Design a protein around this ligand. Structure first.
Ligand SMILES: [Mg+2]
Ligand SMILES: [Mg+2]
Length: 654
DNA sequence: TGAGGTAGTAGGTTGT
RNA sequence: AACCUACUACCUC
């Protein structure tokens, strides 16, 4: 179903590696005394750096392209606790191969260090590792903004360097937190320090003198207040006092037009190829297949979900809606009422607008009003209220949920002419009611696509999932599960997966024959182990896809305009998805399953249009994943405890 | 809290 | 190192 273009992405192919580069030098170290059970990630990776040149680790040890006699062999360094002192013994040199994948990998980590530690010693340059800043874009009175690009280096599998370039900006202050704060700037965003690498937030400055452990008496007695003296008190978190004498502050606040972005990518590329003796940049061109427009369906074919409000829903049902007005007045604003009635006029079944005549200030009594409403058929409520505060906003959302009443907030100074804004709140509201706004008129390989994301919170996270009961279907979610970190427990994945499988059984009378499994970001090794054995055993087929928002790189046209819904395959098992300042395609990886890439690229992009509450825009990632991101965020944000009596056909979190 | 997004500054989980 | 987030600001319908 595709028509080819040819784009080239922001990579460049530079000179092939030469003999000496195809056979690095190995060296064994001395740990005196030996490290610890975790103290090897900065302590093996602090000696591989202390050596100099292009020294970069080789698993349990180090490697170089530099002769070991120009290595610094005998030195002394430490992480806090054990003060080590390294010494380097050799092991000779052994060849490596590009065609072979196993060697191509270590060479890159050398090539990265080559890049990195050949960038340190350049001239009119500012280097933050892989990042290079080449020009001045703005110089302010103690407010410098250097701006070049971020880089990377690796090998091609034919033995030739590759160089990814992408234009960045950096911001660096010159003054103290007083030599600057007494020049105009208000209270700081974050007080970064030079005494350590440590920082803190910024509350409000203490009115009193730190002269009364000891607040001020310890500084000028710790030899910490010599070179620059403390000025006034500081107040932040992990109340605590700090003498604001020495602290090269970290400051926060234009985005470059797409054309200039490619121009600078190519220019900076040349520069780094020629200055670093790596040759002429021959920008890598990949071919990119144009993907087929999906046919999203309300009552009838429509281009953006918000058109369902004028045309009719894909599956409506006998429904009722409540209204909470927290501002002054009382009425459903006619146009919102007229707006709804016409969308249900367009659709098949009937509507009822109710009105909550209760304020939460009534306390417990206000719940009674809710008890009555739900009872009398109310499904979700639209709330009109002046911009609320996060803490109040959450307490209320969760109150209604505790009565099984999803809430859509519309911020109050509203005018008819404010049209898109209220139009989205309405879709949001119906999504929260249970309505199947739009769906996909299509022939797809996976009849069910589930999204997995994780975590909304602090110390612990929630692993959760959302469904689309596919080839248009119902969107529904599942009760999440509290977990330690980002990795969703192996059994929890399967448990969630099954609950999503069973959902399909209830709507189709049949288990699926193919499911689509989508993770947010990288899949931790083996976190889909179970589900996949589990599926295979039940003889239901599948594909697993890592879906990365970051890392897609850039994609540029050779000439013309890159068009919406473009698909570029890269390496085996991996492809980009430009769904159109400068766009950022999704990096996607087929981790498991036997479906051809184009076909997945197809669903994914098509699954993109499904999301019911975007109205006019389309989210960058597939409706299940987005839902998963949204659900999981919201649960973490206001607790799992409120969800019990909330029907999971109702997307309360949009 | 209308929603989508890119661009700076942070940090953290995975996992070497 | 590869990916998530959180703030900020700006754009778009
Ligand atoms: Mg919403
Ligand atoms: Mg995530």
């Amino acid at each position: 179903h595709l028509g080819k273009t040819e784009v080239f992405l922001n990579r460049f192919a530079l000179r092939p590696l030469n003999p000496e580069e195809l056979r690095p030098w190995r060296l064994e170290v001395v740990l005196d005394p030996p490290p610890g059970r975790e103290e090897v990630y900065p302590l093996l990776a602090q000696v591989a750096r202390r050596a100099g040149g292009v020294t970069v680790r080789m698993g349990d040890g180090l490697a170089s392209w530099s002769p070991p006699e120009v290595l610094v062999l005998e030195g002394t360094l430490a992480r806090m606790g054990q003060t080590y002192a390294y010494r380097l013994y050799p092991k000779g040199r052994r060849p490596l191969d590009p065609k072979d994948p196993g060697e191509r990998s270590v060479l890159s980590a050398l090539a990265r260090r080559l890049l990195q530690e050949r960038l340190r010693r350049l001239e009119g340059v500012w280097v933050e590792g892989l990042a290079v800043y080449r020009r001045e874009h703005a110089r302010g009175p103690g407010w410098r903004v250097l701006g070049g690009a971020v880089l990377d280096l690796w090998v091609s599998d034919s033995g030739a360097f590759l160089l990814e370039v992408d234009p960045a900006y950096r911001i660096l202050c010159e003054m103290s937190l007083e030599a600057w704060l007494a020049q105009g700037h208000p209270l700081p965003k974050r007080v970064r320090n030079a005494y350590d690498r440590r920082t803190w937030e910024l509350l409000r400055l203490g009115e009193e003198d730190p002269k009364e452990l000891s607040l001020l008496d310890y500084h000028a007695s710790k030899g910490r207040l010599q070179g620059r003296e403390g000025g006034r008190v500081a107040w932040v978190a992990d109340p605590i006092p700090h003498l604001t004498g020495l602290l090269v502050p970290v400051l926060t606040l234009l985005s470059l037009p797409w054309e200039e972005r490619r121009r600078r990518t190519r220019e900076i590329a040349s520069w780094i190829g020629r200055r670093l003796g790596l040759g002429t940049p021959e920008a890598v061109r990949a071919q990119a297949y144009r993907l087929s427009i999906p046919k999203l369906m309300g009552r009838r074919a429509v281009s953006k979900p918000a058109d369902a409000l004028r045309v009719g829903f894909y599956r409506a049902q006998e429904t009722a809606l409540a209204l909470l007005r927290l501002d002054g007045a009382q009425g459903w604003p006619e146009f919102l009422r007229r707006a709804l009635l016409r969308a249900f006029g367009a659709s098949g079944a009937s509507l009822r607008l109710h009105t909550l005549h209760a304020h939460p200030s009534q306390g417990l009594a206000f719940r009674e009003a809710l008890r009555k409403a739900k009872e009398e058929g109310v499904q979700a409520v639209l709330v009109l209220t002046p911009p609320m505060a996060w803490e109040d906003r959450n307490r209320l959302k969760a109150l209604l949920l505790r009565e099984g009443l999803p809430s859509q907030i519309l911020n109050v100074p509203l005018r008819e002419e404010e049209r898109h804004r209220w139009e989205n709140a309405l879709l949001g509201l119906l999504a929260k009611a249970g309505l199947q706004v739009v769906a996909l008129s299509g022939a797809y390989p996976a009849e069910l696509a589930v999204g997995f994301d994780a975590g909304g919170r602090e110390s612990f996270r929630f692993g959760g999932a959302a469904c689309a009961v596919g080839g248009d279907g119902h969107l529904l979610w599942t009760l999440p599960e509290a977990q330690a970190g980002e990795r969703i427990p192996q059994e929890v994945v399967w448990d969630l997966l099954e609950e999503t499988l069973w959902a399909f059984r209830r709507k189709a009378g049949r288990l699926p024959s193919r499911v689509l499994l989508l993770r947010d970001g990288r899949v931790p090794q083996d976190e889909f182990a179970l589900a996949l054995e589990a599926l295979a055993r039940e003889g239901i087929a599948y594909d697993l896809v890592s879906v990365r928002k970051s890392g897609g790189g850039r994609v540029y046209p050779v000439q013309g305009r890159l068009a919406d819904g473009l698909y570029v395959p890269l390496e085996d098992k991996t492809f980009l998805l430009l769904t159109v300042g400068t766009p950022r395609p999704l990096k996607l990886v087929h981790e498991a399953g036997d479906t051809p890439l184009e076909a997945l690229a197809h669903q994914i992009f098509h699954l993109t249009r499904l999301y019911p509450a975007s109205g006019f825009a389309f989210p960058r990632l597939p409706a299940p994943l987005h839902l998963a991101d949204r659900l999981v965020k919201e649960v973490g944000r206001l607790g799992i405890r409120h969800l019990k009596e909330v029907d999971r056909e109702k997307l309360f979190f949009v």
